[PDB]
C-alpha cells in the first residue's frame, strides 16, 4: 500500500521585507538580526479559507485527479478562521473541489500538515475502494489578536495557504515514510496555568511568558532534553521506517522558523549544512503554520532543485509537543516544474 | 472486523435553569416556551480541555484500557479552547491517557464528535495491530463573546466535556454503521461574505448565526435551503439504518442532538414521526448542546440510566454547520458493570 503526492501547491500573498518591517516599527533590530528572515508573505483581504482553497485548486490541477475520486478533505490551521462555528473545510470543498467526501478541520499547532497527512494516510488505507485526500493548510496572522514578529520571537509567522493531494492510485513522488512522535508533558509550555495542572481562563497571544514559567517548573534541563527526544524519535523512525540514513537525503524540508532556532535545533545538532535545506526559501516565505513541509516540498520540486530519485525529509514540530517525519521519494519530474 | 464503543462518559458542570436564566435577562419567555430547555450544564472556572480530560478520565476508567493501548487521541471542539498556538489534545493526552500515541484537534462544528468518530475507525482499521482510540469534546460558551441563550436561538449551548473510547478488540457495544453526509454549498450560512463569494474580512466580535442565516437565505433562496439540509438528514439517516440492515422500526433508542423543541419537531418528531420518549430529549433539555459531544453523551445517557437494554439498537444522530451530518446505529451487547437497572 504505497501512497503518492500526485499533487501540491501554495498561495502565497506578496512578501514584506524585514526592512519594510523595521522601517514600520513592527520588528526590532535585534529580532530582524538573530532570526536572520529576509521577508514573511503577508496578506490583505484574503481570509484563511479562502487562500487555502487557492493552494488546493493548484494542486487539484496539477494532480489531475477528478473531484469524485478525493475521499476525503481535511483542512488544516493554528489560528483563528474568521468566523465561529462556522465550517472552513467545508468552504475549501465547495470552492477548491465540489464534492461531497466527508470535510473536516485537523489541528496540531504548527505540525497540523503532517497531522492530516496521518489521518488521511488512515483513511485511504482503511477501505480497499478510496483513491484519494486533500489536505489543506490556511492563516491569517493579523491584528488585533497576533504580532507576526513577536507573539512566539525567534519565529515569523506568515499568512498564505497550502495544499497536498495524496493517493493511493499514483503521482510524482512516493511516500517512503511518515512517523508522528508526542510529548505531551511539554503541553504547558504554550499556555496559561500551572504547567503541570489545569488551565487558566482564557487569553491576543503571548508565547515568551509561558514558556519561562514552564521551564522555572519543570526546569531547564528536563525541557530541553524532552525536546531534544522528541525530535530525535521522530527523525530516526522516519530514516528508518524508509530505510535511508541522514546520507542519502538530498534536501531537508525544515520548518520556517529563526535562523537562532534552526541552528539549535538543526543546524548545529544534526551537523548538515543549510544548503542541503530550504532555509534561504523559508527566510523569504516564514512560518505557514501546519503548510511548511508542503511549501517547502512544492518549492524544491517546482524549482527543479530535487531531482528523480532522490529521498526529500520533511521535517515538522509543533507545540504539544508533537513532530513528524517523513521521507518523500521523487519518482519524476512532473509538468509543472521547471528543470 | 467491527468495531466496539469500549468506555464513555461525560463531565458536566452544575445546571443553571431556565428560571435563573429569565431572571437574569439571559432568556426571554418567547424563547423559553418554543425550546422548551430546563436547564442547561454552566461551567465556572473549567476550561474545555479541562472537561474533556475529565470525560475522558471517566472513560478510560470504566473501559478498562491500558493508556498503551490508545494509539489515538482525538479532541473535537467548536468554540474557543483557552490558549492560542497551544495543544488542547496534548493537555486531554497529558492529564487523561498519559501515553504517546499521536494527540490531534478534529473540527467540523457540531458534528465534530462523529466526524473525530470516522477518522478514529479509520486510523484503527489502517493497521492490524492498533487496538483503541479515544475521543473527546469539551467547549465553554461564556460572554462575550458567545450568548448561549441567542447567539444560535433554538438552540442553547452548554459547556461541558464527553469522552468515547472506541475499540477493535472488545467492548459492551458493536458499532453496526457510521456513515458522514456533506453539503458543502450550505458553508456560507454560518459566516459573513458573499454566500457563494469569499469570507468576510471582518471578524464580528459577538456571534449572531442569526444574521448570517438571513443573509444566506435571502440570496440562496429559502426553498433551496430547507431542501439541502432536509435531504442531506435523509441521506445520513438512511444510510445508516442500511449500512447496519435495520429500519427506523428497529430503533429502540434515538440519541437526538440537545437542540430547543421547536428545531427538534421540525427536523425529527413530525418528519421521522418517532415519539419524544424513545428519545434523549429529556436529558437534553437539562444539559443543553455541547457541540459535537451531544451524541457521546446522550449515549453514555442510556446505557448508565439503563435505558438500553442488550441486544437493543440505538440511533445516534449528529449534525453540524456546513453544513455535515453522521448516524450511526449501535447494538447494546452488554451492561456495563458502571450502569444502573
Same mark, same amino acid.
Given at each position: ?19 519594510? +518591517? ?20 503577508? @496578506?490583505?483581504?484574503?481570509? *484563511? ?27 488544516? %490551521? ?33 505540525? !497540523?500538515?503532517? @497531522? ?65 512522535? /508526542? ?14 495542572? *489545569? *488551565? ?20 531547564? /534541563? ?21 530505510? +535511508? !540514513? ?16 534552526? /541552528?539549535? +535545533? ?26 511548511? *513541509? ?21 521535517? %515538522? ?6 513532530? /513528524? ?15
Amino acid at each position: 500500500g504505497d501512497l503518492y503526492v500526485a499533487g501540491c501547491g501554495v498561495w502565497l500573498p506578496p512578501p514584506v521585507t524585514t526592512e519594510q +518591517a523595521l522601517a514600520a516599527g513592527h520588528c526590532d533590530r535585534r529580532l530582524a538580526s538573530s532570526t536572520r528572515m529576509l521577508s514573511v508573505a503577508v @496578506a490583505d483581504k484574503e481570509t *484563511p479559507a479562502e487562500m487555502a482553497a487557492l493552494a488546493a485548486q493548484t494542486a487539484l490541477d496539477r494532480s489531475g485527479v477528478a473531484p469524485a475520486h478525493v475521499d476525503l478533505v481535511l483542512h488544516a %490551521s493554528l489560528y483563528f478562521q474568521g468566523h465561529h462555528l462556522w465550517a472552513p473545510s467545508s468552504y475549501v470543498q465547495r470552492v477548491a473541489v465540489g464534492n461531497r467526501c466527508p470535510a473536516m478541520e485537523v489541528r496540531q499547532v504548527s505540525n !497540523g500538515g503532517m @497531522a492530516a497527512l496521518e489521518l488521511a494516510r488512515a483513511y485511504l488505507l482503511a477501505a480497499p475502494d478510496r483513491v484519494a485526500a486533500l489536505i489543506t493548510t490556511g492563516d491569517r496572522m493579523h491584528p488585533p489578536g497576533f504580532d507576526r514578529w513577536s507573539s512566539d520571537p525567534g519565529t515569523v509567522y506568515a499568512d498564505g495557504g497550502t495544499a497536498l493531494v495524496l493517493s493511493r492510485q499514483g503521482g510524482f513522488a512516493r511516500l517512503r515514510s511518515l512517523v508522528t512522535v /508526542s510529548e505531551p508533558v511539554l503541553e504547558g509550555m504554550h499556555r496559561g496555568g500551572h504547567p503541570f495542572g *489545569p *488551565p487558566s481562563p482564557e487569553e491576543a497571544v503571548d508565547l515568551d511568558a509561558h514558556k519561562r514559567a514552564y521551564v522555572a517548573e519543570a526546569g531547564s /534541563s528536563f525541557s530541553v532534553a524532552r525536546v531534544s527526544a522528541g525530535q530525535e524519535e521522530a527523525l530516526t523512525g522516519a530514516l528508518e521506517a524508509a530505510g +535511508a !540514513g541522514l546520507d542519502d537525503i538530498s534536501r531537508v524540508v525544515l520548518p520556517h522558523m529563526g535562523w537562532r532556532r534552526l /541552528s539549535a +535545533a538543526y543546524f548545529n545538532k544534526w551537523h548538515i549544512q543549510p544548503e542541503r535545506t530550504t532555509w534561504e526559501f523559508g527566510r523569504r516565505t516564514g512560518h505557514l503554520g501546519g503548510g511548511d *513541509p508542503i511549501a517547502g516540498f512544492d518549492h524544491l520540486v517546482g524549482s527543479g532543485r530535487l531531482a528523480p530519485g532522490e529521498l526529500c525529509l520533511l521535517v %515538522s514540530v509543533g507545540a504539544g509537543f508533537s513532530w /513528524s517525519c517523513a521521507v518523500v521519494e521523487l519518482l519524476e519530474r512532473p509538468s509543472w516544474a521547471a528543470a
